[PDB]
């Protein structure tokens, strides 16, 4: 199986998922100087007031906080998007050290982690159908730097010891993802892909300029998670990020400045 270990990491994925070397792969380096301001972009609309979290799962690659997406409750719209995208889950990618961990980079700068709020286009009826379409998903990307704690993150951090190993899940209700957003919704956007296999080219990426601050103790707790299942040799869950991929024939647009 693919992973991020010594022998099955990102440079190996193409052998099972040939679209790894495709025309619209993610993440990418965001060259701030060459991203053009696009005054036709709209403000992003993040409507998470009715979000219903249900569960948190260690899937052996990251942990996902899953939402009830059976009704139009936590939606992302506007920005570069046409139509309405419903929140299904969020997860993070992070490093073994504070100097690395994000998937997207900003003029080659790597952040300590990166949060992905994953949304699917309601015109496709469900997630599984949406990932088959070029405009199927919108992922809202938010950088994490180490500094002041993020109080809105602590409930997530505190449950991780209950889902240490691959395939563990825990009840995770009433979590409000608004506590994870920075103050500004200024963003960059570009057409890309899932950053893990199956690496489908179905994502409008929206990457916020303003990172959120999390404490060293918070990100330390992410690094105590395990890639392995229970009663297998311990492999800390760290460096679960794909490096920047060739931008190819794509423009990154800025909503600002
Ligand atoms: N193209 S892909 O899906 O990324 C993929 C890549 C590599 C494999 C073989 N994996 C391994 N082979 C040898 N030793 C190991 O320790 C692992 N391992 O770590 O799994 C299987 C699938
Ligand atoms: N890192 S990211 O780009 O935000 C991101 C990556 C993967 C997903 C959903 N995963 C899947 N999607 C479709 N088919 C699949 O088979 C899987 N799967 O097997 O996981 C959602 C978001
Ligand atoms: Zn992700």
Swiss-Prot record:
Result when mutating residue 91 to C/D/E/N/Q: Strongly reduced CO(2) hydrase and p-nitrophenyl acetate esterase activities, impaired stability of zinc binding
Effect upon mutating residue 89 to P: In OPTB3; in Czechoslovakia
Known outcome of mutating residue 62 to F: Reduced activity
Effect of residue 59 to A: Reduced activity
Gene Ontology CC terms, in alphabetical order: apical part of cell; cytoplasm; cytosol; extracellular exosome; myelin sheath; plasma membrane
Top-level taxon: Eukaryota
Swiss-Prot/TrEMBL catalytic activity: hydrogencarbonate + H(+) = CO2 + H2O; urea = cyanamide + H2O
Record protein name field: Carbonic anhydrase 2
Species whose genome carries this gene: Homo sapiens (Human)
